[PDB]
Structure formats: C-alpha cells, structure tokens
C-alpha cells in the first residue's frame, strides 16, 4: 500500500475511535446524572400504577 492510502486510512480509523471514545465518556456522565436525579429512561424504578385505583363512590363518604 502506498503511504497516502495508509495515511488516510489511519485518519478514518482515528475518526471512528475518537467518536467512540467521546460517546463512552458521555454515556458515563449521562448515567451519573440519570441515576442521581431519576429523570430519564434509565434507572426508572417502578411505582404503583394509578389505574389500579377505584374511584367509584364507596360504602361510606369520607374516603
């Protein structure tokens, strides 16, 4: 292979590895924020579904 091909094949390789490296760092910081604040799709621990509640009038009024 000529030096030009290897040279520019290297730039292609470095672009992919740099982009992957940045995403790896970003994911660690996103995971840190999502877990601490609970405001994202990850670390979304379930709460009781509200469709289970019955809103019909009860046997007694104060409820």
């Amino acid at each position: 292979d000529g030096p030009e091909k290897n040279y520019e094949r290297t730039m292609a390789i470095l672009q992919i590895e740099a982009e992957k490296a940045e995403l790896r760092l970003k994911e660690l910081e996103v995971r840190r924020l999502m877990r601490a604040r609970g405001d994202g799709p990850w670390f979304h621990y379930p709460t009781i579904d509200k469709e289970l509640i019955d809103h019909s009038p009860k046997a007694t009024p104060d409820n």
Binding site: I16, E19, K20, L23, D39, G40, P41
Partner: protein
C-alpha cells in the same frame, strides 16, 4: 295520600338538582409532579455499534 314505595323503589339511584357548586379539589391534592421529559424521535442505528471495547459491530 301517602303511598308506600314498591319493592326496589328506595334502592334506586336518583338524580338530585342542587345549587351548591361542585367542589374543585375535594382531596386537597397538591400539584402533581411533572412527568419525565418524553423521549421521541426516529430510532437510528447505534453509532458505531455496541462500542464495547474492541468490538466493531
């Protein structure tokens, strides 16, 4: 002129007209917390695949 109600009359659910206004927050509820911001958009392939260590796919 009092007529005795029939069997089943007094257990009927009836409608009643009232001039009292329907209560607004009978449970005295606080404001509900806002929902988590919805994630929407077009699902695109993962950028450079899994990106797990050396794997290229």
């Amino acid at each position: 002129g009092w007529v005795r109600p029939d069997l089943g009359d007094l257990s009927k659910v009836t409608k009643v007209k009232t001039d009292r206004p329907l209560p607004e927050n009978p449970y005295h509820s606080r404001a509900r917390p806002e929902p988590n911001p919805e994630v929407e958009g077009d699902l695109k392939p993962a950028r450079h695949g899994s990106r797990l260590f050396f794997w290229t796919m």
